[PDB]
Amino acid sequence: QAQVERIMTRKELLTVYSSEDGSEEFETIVLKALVKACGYLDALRLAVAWNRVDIAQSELFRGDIQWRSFHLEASLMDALL
Amino acid sequence: SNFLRLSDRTDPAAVYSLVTRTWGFRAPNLVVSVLGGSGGPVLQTWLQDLLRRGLVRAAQSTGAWIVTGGLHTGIGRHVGVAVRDHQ
């Protein structure tokens, strides 16, 4: 019980892979887990690191995220390099 | 992206003539004047799907104009992102 309590002490890192009747959508779940853990590191830079452009398309498509200049500039530099 | 500054008390006939002839825009077979405050930057998934799939698609098919507020806020931002995604 003490170990479980210490685990929950940092529950930000832990994330549950929702069964979702076998969603088999691994990249998006990984990205969500990394974003939650982070609380610079951006989902855009990671997506650029991978070759998945659809993931970044979904990330940017949602209007919830509001982007600044340097935020996109760094990702653009990464994509160019 | 043609811009213009004009007084509110302006006859719309001159504006329409300028848009149609000088700026090269064809006559609109249909005009959709989109309204809606849409409090909160986020918008529902079904509404966004409708805009990007129902409104913008129809506008391109019929060569219609979409009249909104030319600002990066409110429903104007949602309409703009729908247009961009459709493109």
Curated annotation (Swiss-Prot), chain A:
Residues that coordinate or bind Ca(2+) 1: D42, A43
PTM entry text: Phosphorylation by PKC leads to increase the sensitivity to Ca(2+).
Residues given in the record as ATP 2 binding sites: R68
Family: Belongs to the transient receptor (TC 1.A.4) family. LTrpC subfamily. TRPM4 sub-subfamily.
Stated role: Calcium-activated selective cation channel that mediates membrane depolarization. While it is activated by increase in intracellular Ca(2+), it is impermeable to it. Mediates transport of monovalent cations (Na(+) > K(+) > Cs(+) > Li(+)), leading to depolarize the membrane. It thereby plays a central role in cadiomyocytes, neurons from entorhinal cortex, dorsal root and vomeronasal neurons, endocrine pancreas cells, kidney epithelial cells, cochlea hair cells etc.
Binding partners and assembly: Homotetramer.
Clinical note on disease: Progressive familial heart block 1B: A cardiac bundle branch disorder characterized by progressive alteration of cardiac conduction through the His-Purkinje system, with a pattern of a right bundle-branch block and/or left anterior hemiblock occurring individually or together. It leads to complete atrio-ventricular block causing syncope and sudden death.
Notes concerning its domains: TRPM4, is a temperature-sensitive ion channel, it adopts distinct conformations at different temperatures, markedly influencing where and how ligands interact with it. Decavanadate (a positive modulator), ATP (an inhibitor) and Ca(2+) bind to different locations of TRPM4 at physiological temperatures or at lower temperatures.
Name of the protein: Transient receptor potential cation channel subfamily M member 4
Provenance organism: Homo sapiens
